[PDB]
Design a binder for this molecule. Structure first.
Ligand SMILES: Fc1ccc(C2=NNC3=NCCN3C2)cc1F
Ligand SMILES: [Cl-]
Ligand SMILES: [Cl-]
Ligand SMILES: [Mg+2]
Lengths: 142, 128
């Protein structure tokens, strides 16, 4: 998957496609928009390929990671989704949306203590009042 | 992964990790790097294996490579902010002090590791 690719790239430490500027920003932006065209039409399998392609080129991009994580959550691949949401959070320190979704995934993974920690982080640190209500509704049910 | 098919026994993998750390502690960086690369090929999803290779890259002043691995290590472990602390150090070396500040702030806001937070605060205090 995307994470294994990132680690292999790191182990081998060779020239990556991004390191050589193999695809310009404008083209990457276009491909990202195409990925969501597929996604928005329910063509989740094509969208997944396009987001995997984006994540091979530039894994450390919050927008690419969040798109792929969303697909895995929809497909009920909850551990892969949680792992990617956690990457997205590390890259995007100030957005607690990936932490909220990690909590949802942890609940489906039968890990309520991890989920509780996620939802509590949202309540204590997010400035998104609507996200906080949603996190509290999950907390109330745990 | 090779771990998924149990290609090497568990006890032998523990030995190899301990040998990797022995090389690391003795300053035998080239050998530790081989051993941590071996471990990460065997199980890319082992946070401690990733952290070891990331540490080697940081010592070698390959700061971006280290930060990239620390991001994966953080994600897999979810609740351990040690990789975030080391990323902050890497960002300082990469002349990205605002990114470093965000890393150290994240450690202090989320971590339950008091000794780690003391270290993070000492870096924050020094950031201009
Ligand atoms: F906690 C972390 C926060 C950011 C990063 C990062 N690593 N690598 C990286 N490449 C482009 C942006 N970016 C941030 C790693 C962490 F471990
Ligand atoms: Cl937020
Ligand atoms: Cl900066
Ligand atoms: Mg608040």
């Amino acid at each position: 998957g995307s994470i294994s690719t990132a680690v292999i790239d790191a182990i081998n430490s060779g020239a990556t496609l991004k390191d050589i500027n193999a695809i310009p920003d404008d083209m990457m932006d276009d491909i990202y928009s195409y990925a969501y065209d597929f996604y928005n039409k329910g063509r989740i399998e094509e969208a997944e390929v396009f987001f995997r392609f984006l994540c091979i080129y530039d894994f450390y991009n919050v927008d690419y990671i969040m798109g792929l994580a969303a697909i895995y959550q929809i497909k009920e691949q909850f551990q892969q989704a949680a792992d990617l949401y956690a990457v997205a959070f590390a890259l995007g320190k100030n957005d607690y949306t990936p932490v909220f979704h990690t909590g949802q995934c942890q609940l489906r993974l039968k890990a309520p203590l991890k989920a509780k920690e996620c939802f509590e982080l949202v309540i204590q640190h997010s400035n998104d009042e609507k996200l906080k209500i949603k996190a509290q509704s999950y907390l109330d049910a745990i």
